[model samples]
Target: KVFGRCELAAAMKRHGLDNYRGYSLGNWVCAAKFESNFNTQATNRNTDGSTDYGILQINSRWWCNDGRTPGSRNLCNIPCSALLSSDITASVNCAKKIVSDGNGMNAWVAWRNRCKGTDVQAWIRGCRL
Candidate 1:
């Protein structure tokens, strides 16, 4: 499923991403836009043989257990498949875990390139809280 810009922003805010780990809600919104384009089923396979899943693009290499990514820590203790659910809570929590783990939002390259040090507020422009 796909979410509209404001829909995704509101959901992230409700899920406690408004200022999660010092990153603003706009940062999360920007990451979602660049990483997955607000699509729940988005997935990416890395050149290192790891896969990222869901709107937040949580990785199988470290956060989730895909059972196929070599050397997976699975610290989130969640199946990689769960990240693709439309419920979004799973992806939100997993993303929270990733941030609180000290990786910061930079764990996702999209955040680094498109969100970090940029005008992230524009990503959520006109969204009502």
Candidate 2:
């Protein structure tokens, strides 16, 4: 299902995003746009190779380490492994790093058309607060 602003914001909180505005919102959106086109249950079916699924685009088989067919985590559920130390904030920071790395969100924007490459500056226009 498509995870909207409220759902995603709540998901971020469930994952420990105490601060839901400013960088947090921007980062979460960035990751959502990049990894899964804001689709919490987005899944890629590999015709020739492996695939990626979930919000983080995390490989279900690789991360879950489970032996179930189509083993995918509920992006809404928020895995502890991803949020054990801190919430999905790391994903947000990673998005910034992707921006800093000169990818300009184009690095990850191909998946969602969010234009994080061009819109990221506007998305995260506030952080000094």
Candidate 3:
């Protein structure tokens, strides 16, 4: 596990993620809550025959190499295992690149399904920034 909500927000803020790539910090926090519940080790096998890894739940099909996903795009050029580390620099960097590529937070299905237009403030409630 990497962080609880408050700590995650503070850490994200420290990393200049408070207002990042034109999206609010709430978007990142809320998405992370639903995506991996702040656990860096989180992984999920999707029905699309792909795996999502880490706090941002980046996919094996495009972002990273999982070995089993043949012909991965690996735009991040890092191993999926790197995303599972408690230190989230790699995952955060990859996510920044993802946003810069134009998807915004919409790259995450959880953001679309749960956080988009919802009250994202709750994800950072009581967090001292």
Winning candidate number (TM-score): 1
> On residues 3-102, what C-alpha lDDT tens digit does candidate 2 reach at each position?
6655655655555443433334555556666667666456664543334555655443333322343544433233423422223454443333334444
For candidate 1, the 10 contiguous residues with the lowest summed lDDT are 101-110
Point out where model 1 deviates above 4 Å: none
Model 2 residue runs over 4 Å out of place are 18-23, 45-48, 66-129
Residue-wise lDDT of candidate 3 within 28-108, one digit each (tens)?
999898999999999999887789999989999989988888667898999999999988888888888888887788899
Cα error, candidate 1, residue 104 (Å): 1.3
| Model 3 spans > 4 angstroms off | none
Better of 2 and 3 by lDDT: 3
- The RMSD (Cα, Å) of candidate 3 is 1.2
Greater lDDT among 1 and 2 belongs to: 1
TM-score of each: 0.95, 0.44, 0.93
The number of residue pairs in model 1 that clash at the backbone is 0
TM-score for candidate 2, please give it: 0.44
What lDDT would candidate 2 get against the real structure? 0.47
Cα-based lDDT for every prediction: 0.91, 0.47, 0.87
Among residues 3 or more apart in sequence or in different chains, the pairs in candidate 3 whose N, CA or C atoms overlap within 3 Å are none
Task: Give the lDDT of residue 87 in candidate 1.
Answer: 83
